Amino acid sequence: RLTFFDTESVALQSRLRYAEKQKLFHQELDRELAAGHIASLVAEYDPVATRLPFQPMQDRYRV
């Protein structure tokens, strides 16, 4: 049967590769959206608050 009477295996392999591409696309997209959500916090981020009173600001915190 498998040697002479099957196309379902090939069709399913093709469909599963398609599914893999779809899965990874959706994954990357969701990751991108979450990264943009986190990027929306860079405006709220204030690197001056890391300064200690009567001390200079550090370039480590992206002046």
């Binding site: 599963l16 599914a19 899965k23 959706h26 969701d30 979450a34 990264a35 943009g36 959500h37 986190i38």
Partner: protein, 96 residues
């Protein structure tokens, strides 16, 4: 990508804000992955589950004692006789 504090479904999971954890698992994940089935779970045995088949269980056996009976019984007609008046069948089938 427009209303971040109002769209929580498209936002990262609370494990992403925590800044602490061969190949590692990814650090950033969204809640929108909840709308996909095979995001986290694997696709193993995806196309082989509709192939596990099970047969029916009906037995077509019934003893037919006619010695108990001495009368005929009615019987349905299942289809119209096309071997007779074949040419006229569309023309008389609607009558009675």
């Amino acid at each position: 990508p427009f209303m971040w504090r109002q769209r929580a479904y498209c936002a990262p999971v609370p494990s992403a804000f925590a800044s602490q954890q061969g190949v590692r698992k990814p650090l950033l994940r969204s809640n929108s992955e909840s709308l996909s089935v095979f995001s986290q779970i694997p696709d193993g045995l995806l196309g082989h589950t509709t192939s596990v088949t099970m047969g029916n269980s009906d037995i077509f056996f019934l003893p037919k004692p006619s010695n108990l009976l001495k009368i005929a019984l009615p019987a349905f007609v299942f289809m119209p006789n096309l071997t007779i008046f074949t040419r006229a069948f569309p023309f008389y089938a609607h009558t009675s």
